[PDB]
Symmetry: D3
Subunit: 233 residues, 6 copies
């Protein structure tokens, strides 16, 4: 009866994130790491550990999978953006990744992390060149005014998914010049499954300003149908 | 330009539920309802509308899909519950279904629906025989305390998913008896996927009090590995 | 030894029906019913028993699986039929279900079941209110010529599958009214596979009197492309 | 309004067989046969006709598909049957096939086909060497003690599917010597689905006289779990 | 141990296997004779590798059953008096073509061409209407050396070296109207790897060849590679 | 026209494509800017060929994202001083490996061995820490001649010729405990085509090499071919 004295957490705290913001190399349970080559044909063919979010960049966790990394790579190489914003930080491995990548492409880029809870960031202070954190609430649209200094072209990425359509209208009006991206990750397929009528009306409300970039918008499951930018249709 | 003059409801509110608690029948957009038989083989084979949650019961939207209904039908026939508690209510279609089914079966059952927002419920007052609504909070257990003098057997069903494991602890200590069910719809495969270490330990904390019922636990994707009892 | 001493029942008698018209709850063999929770993840994920026809309604077996039940629910709620005729009966599970469901909806509806052999039926006689059995050979236009005048709207369901296109020509001329359904369960995808030319033409012969109802024709594997109704 | 002046054949007579015993080549309806190579990539990737049973041997229809043919080709090469009995005939395509293939392999084999209705047979009277058609009723078992005693080894194939287990009980007692095959095409997977208890128990009756030949029993979809032989 | 052996390049056996001779499959992890009393406990998988299991009369067959069915229909329609196969390996398909044309009553001459014939397993006694020819591919003169052959003619590429030039020569010097030129296996791969070059090269033959859509989509090995001469 | 053209052998492009230089994809059947008011009508597929559409800093990449992710992890764990690609093509892999070791801060040299370094597309300025070498995969003297590099080292085989002989050489004269010998793409094909000989050949290295199960199942290019030293 271990339950009778336990206080249990709401496991929803870990929705789509996992339990620990820091990376740990996967650990084999039902097999040796070194398999005998004389019994090579008998060796189990499955992954060996959970395939939920096993990705990393330099000892930091990555919530963007390799297919998403390939898309953002092409997008960065093409646009050569001076600014990449990120609503939703979590552990910050995405922030660091964008920074490292741009550095090697020779793009002078500023990466910006806005979140209401920056406590879980895992980047060391001694590895923060061209990265800026920003405490803020999504619901509050005035969180976003103070990033009207940054240069163009610009990529705005929504990994937070709250008050998102109001944030999209705020950006369109006050932020995005021609060519800039507004990308919503993960959620467009769910909103459209759960709310076809309202979703189509809201998305279509931006028919005069944004468009879906078809070169990138079907190239990874995380970005599926959610990559937009300020360009004429 | 229609984006500026409009202001946007948050679509997260319609998550796993939909835009509207009232039932509306599907409507065809890209094909006539009445396909002519002389061109019978040209007719599209796909369903012709959203497969999201198109199910109903007597004009009330039903979130439990036909496979889950089959499972619960068998559970009711086998266990003949005196009480069905539904945590999380939405449109009330589950409540009216559970009541109608126990009525044709001859079982004397009270259905109970607990939820913080009951405004979405579509059951008319006139059809509430053996159904009781209850407005309360998950995060405090006082909600449930009051009226733990219901007859058994009992089936408790979590459709709210807040403070779930505490509510289950409370349930074993105060409500449940041998043969009663505690059922976690939908969530378990996700909680395991995302927090496996923590979930495993938590579920196994209940090893001396609850067990997974293997006759029902693999029979529906909504009840997948969440049918517990005793 | 055992083989010489037996008479062997022909197994085609049980085609798509099972060995026993009475219901029995499925039984686990390779696992305990109450899996311990400290090994929750170790538990097997498959069903644990045959998926053939394990469906029931109040202790009666159901040959229409849950998805078909959903389609018939919507159709009953929309049309509010006065009569439902089932061609082929077996255990009566559907009959009971149809009557019970119309009762719950407040639809005054008589349910009629027709079969050559009504000995399999399992409905307790004290539970036949608004259910009528007719004994009679399906492949005989006589059986339907002898039926009384029923109330409309009506749903006519073919679960027998013998001499079916003649029965349908009779239905169109003598029974069906605007809005009424002639449903063929199970059989149409097979008839199309084995006889595409003859089937296409035969079905096409009813182009001015029946149409495929597209709201329900693709909503279930059992009713798939077999939901028809009068006019348009 | 063509339905009122039509003669409706029973489509069930075509089950698993088709409309016409005679072969006719498949035909394209929605594309040219000669696709131009300057639009090669635009060309469709799908078969272009019904994939139910488009197989032939020398202008005769073959109900046995290529995978099943491959299994029989090997079984013949290994066993070198002196006799092949095919219970159930239709167009006689597999009869001709069996005779033709055994002839090419240098096997001295007699192909026998039994059926109630031999009218459909499409084999010319002239091309009938080493092939005997018997009249037969699967209900009466002195139809098979109407065997002139043929040579061994012997393959016995069931394509008729009536009174099958009794015809099997008979085969063991009067025909099958060490190594002879009794094959049931098509039915076994469906019988296990519908009557798992009886099927398991009936087959289990023959444990001391027949075994399932695992070299071939998993090798095609039509012979699936249906290939058996004498002893072990 | 590894310190001793000289290692053969395994690329030698690509798409072919280690041994041109046929040997029947052998079960490793089950009895060949499965007891009927535990019939449902029997494993459902093939029980041996499925790389290239097929045979004709004790010779390996690299063309699988679906491919044989297409060639069977082609041969029966077209009635070729010459079948050329560029690339030979074990000779299985060579003997199959000859045997099929023989029971079809067609007067066909099957020709086999290869730089290495040492792997050909056809017995010299079973060689009638078959000619082996040992020449290199990229040298087009190999082919001039025998356009004495009768028509209709089916030319088959199983070697895949310098294929388009060989097709050019064939179009000009060999193929009368109706004749086939088939590329097995490779065209899907060439389109995947070099889509611009492949399309342009295939389109360069638009007034002389077409894709035969009756056979081009009917097997995975022939897939989009069955071409024939349209009148010019 | 065809009789004019001399046709290149498409096998030259096998596994690589026609152009070592990167060009981004373009759409044919859709606009790049899809209008949001038609968002649900937009096509769902990629829009271009998904053969080898990957890149690094304007250079082609043959290793796909999942493979990249396995090499990322490996590099971070192993901190290799020397990485050796056996086969170069366009050099994309070389540049990535060098760039990646640089952002991780690892002091690494990258060597690229190939008979043909002509297709290499790395600009002269960006060659810091990237030594190239001409040589044949038939000399084991090609590999000695490469001066002694620091360890830990990884050895990737992307040429696949005389590989097992090259593996024996590396174990004895080059590889220390924990160094890697990785064979890309090829092992699953060599075990399908030659199961017996591959089983025996790999088996010989049991005392000096293991399979690294942390990485061996994590991508389809590396599938079952990542090795190092110390098992059982
Ligand atoms: Mg993401
Ligand atoms: Mg519910
Ligand atoms: Mg049914
Ligand atoms: Mg082949
Ligand atoms: Mg590779």
């Amino acid at each position: 009866n271990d339950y009778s004295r336990q206080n249990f957490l709401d496991l929803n705290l870990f929705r789509g994130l996992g339990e620990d913001p820091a990376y740990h190399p996967p650990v084999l349970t039902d097999r040796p790491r070194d398999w005998p080559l004389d019994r090579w044909a008998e060796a189990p063919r499955d992954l060996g550990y959970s395939d939920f979010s096993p990705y990393q960049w330099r000892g930091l966790r990555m919530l963007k999978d390799p297919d998403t990394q390939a898309v953002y790579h092409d997008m960065l190489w093409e646009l050569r953006p001076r600014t990449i914003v990120e609503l939703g930080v979590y552990n910050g491995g995405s922030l660091a990744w964008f920074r490292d990548l741009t550095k090697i492409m020779g793009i002078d880029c500023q990466v910006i992390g806005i979140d209401r809870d920056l406590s879980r960031c895992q980047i060391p202070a001694s590895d923060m060149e061209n990265i800026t954190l920003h405490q803020g609430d999504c619901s509050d649209l005035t969180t976003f005014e103070h990033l009207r200094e940054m240069a163009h072209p610009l990529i705005f990425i929504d990994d937070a998914h709250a008050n998102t359509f109001n944030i999209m209208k705020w950006a369109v009006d006050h932020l995005l010049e021609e060519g800039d991206y507004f990308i919503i990750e993960d959620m467009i397929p769910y909103w459209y499954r759960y709310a076809p009528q309202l979703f189509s009306e809201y998305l279509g409300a931006f028919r005069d300003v944004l468009s879906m970039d078809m070169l990138y918008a079907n190239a990874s499951s995380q970005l599926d149908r959610g990559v937009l930018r300020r360009v004429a249709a």
